[PDB]
Every structure is written in structure tokens, then in C-alpha cells.
């Protein structure tokens, strides 16, 4: 699809078994999921945009479903306000800019 | 342009005079652009991201070149590690996400 940017561009991502509403986000290099009590193994890191940083749980290999569009890679577990998807996954769903 | 997300989305910008470089991101609600000098009378707003919110001064109807693309709108200046070009600018220059 197309997705025009006069509002964000949120979409629903399936996560987890869940289903989820996500931004798309070309700023983002990594992806971001609210709080979720996933099983697995995982790694701290912190990630900073803006004012700030957080502290995540960084999950690899974790299949997310992005509009039906299937990819898999890390993704980052933490105390986000909005579930980020960063071009890691992005550039799996073959997602461009254009202008 | 089509602009693939392999690497982040840098491009140079024209701001004030002056070329900057600059993220595509489509995350962001505002232009938001380190610390310069720009005209005009400008109001303090506070903004946020993810991980903590910070000051800036917004300025209005600024023109902006985007890789030779012209918009004219709000510019928000302040303390961010990277400057970045939101989507009050970006639907000006009519830029989609497309996958
Ligand atoms: C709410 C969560 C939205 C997240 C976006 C993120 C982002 O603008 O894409 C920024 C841009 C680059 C940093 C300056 N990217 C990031 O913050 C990402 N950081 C990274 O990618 C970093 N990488 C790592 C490994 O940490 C990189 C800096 O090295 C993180 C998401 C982590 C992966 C963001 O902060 N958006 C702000 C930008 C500021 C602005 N005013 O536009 C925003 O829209 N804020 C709105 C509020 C959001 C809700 N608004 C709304 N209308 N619904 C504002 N008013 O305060």
C-alpha cells in the first residue's frame, strides 16, 4: 500500500500472537514494542531519540507481520508511549520513500 | 526520489542560507533542527519523544529546500542530536511511504 503522511502513519503489526497498532517510522533504526511479556532471551540495551534514553529488552529473530507483510528480526521490548517500527523491518517489507 | 531504508534516510536541506544535513522521518510530527539563528519572532513550545521531552523555539513559514524541493512551514529549533525533517514538512514536498 500507500501511505500518506498528513496524519502518522500507523498501521497494525501481528506480534507476539498479538495484534498491535504501530508507526512507521524511516527515523527509527530499530523497532520498539510497548511492554509485552514475551518468553525468550534477550539483551540489554538503551535507545535514545530527543531528551532522552530508554532501557529495552533487545529480543532477536521475533517474526512481526506488518500490514500482512511478513518480516523477522530484533525487536526491542521496553516503556514506549507508541510501538515504533524502524527500518530494520521496514527494509524487510520493502517499504520506500517517494517524492 | 524513491529513498530505500538500508541506511538512514540523509539528505541535504537549505535552511536560512544554509545547507544542513538532515533525517527523513516520518515518525516525527514537526521539523526540528539544532541550534541556529533563524528570522522572524519565534514562541516557546515543548516536545517530546520515546525518551523525554525537550525545549525549543518554534518559527513559522520558514522556507526549507529539501533536496531541491521547496516547502515553507514550521521549523522547531532546539537541543536534538540529529536535525530531522518531519511531516508537516514532508506532505509538502509530497512524500509517501510506500511498500
Ligand atoms: C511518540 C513516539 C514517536 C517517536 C519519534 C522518533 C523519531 O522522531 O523517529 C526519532 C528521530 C531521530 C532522533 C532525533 N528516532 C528515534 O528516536 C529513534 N532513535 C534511533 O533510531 C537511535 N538509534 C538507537 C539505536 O537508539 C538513533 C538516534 O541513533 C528511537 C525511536 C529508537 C529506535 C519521535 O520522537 N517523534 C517526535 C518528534 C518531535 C516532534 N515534535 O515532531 C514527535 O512526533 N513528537 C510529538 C508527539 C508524538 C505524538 N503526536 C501526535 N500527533 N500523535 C511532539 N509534539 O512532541
Known amino acids: 500500500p500507500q501511505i500518506t503522511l498528513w496524519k502518522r502513519?500507523?498501521?497494525?503489526?501481528?506480534?507476539?500472537?498479538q495484534l498491535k497498532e504501530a508507526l512507521l517510522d524511516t527515523?527509527?533504526?530499530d523497532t520498539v514494542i510497548e511492554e509485552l511479556?514475551?518468553?525468550?532471551?534477550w539483551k540489554p540495551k538503551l535507545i535514545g531519540g530527543x531528551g532522552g534514553?530508554?532501557?529495552?529488552?533487545?529480543?532477536?529473530?521475533?517474526?512481526v507481520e506488518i500490514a500482512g507483510h511478513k518480516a523477522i528480526?530484533?525487536?526491542?521490548?521496553?516503556?514506549?508511549?507508541?510501538?515504533?517500527?524502524?527500518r530494520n523491518l521496514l527494509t524487510?517489507?520493502?517499504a520506500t520513500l517517494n517524492f
Chains 1, 2 share one sequence.
Open 73 to 86: 528480526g530484533t525487536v526491542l521490548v521496553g516503556p514506549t508511549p507508541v510501538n515504533i517500527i524502524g
Open 37 to 41: 511479556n514475551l518468553p525468550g532471551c
Open 27 to 29: 527515523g527509527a533504526d
Open 9 to 17: 502513519p500507523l498501521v497494525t503489526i501481528r506480534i507476539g500472537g
Open 53 to 63: 534514553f530508554i532501557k529495552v529488552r533487545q529480543y532477536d529473530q521475533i517474526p
Open 92 to 94: 524487510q517489507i520493502g
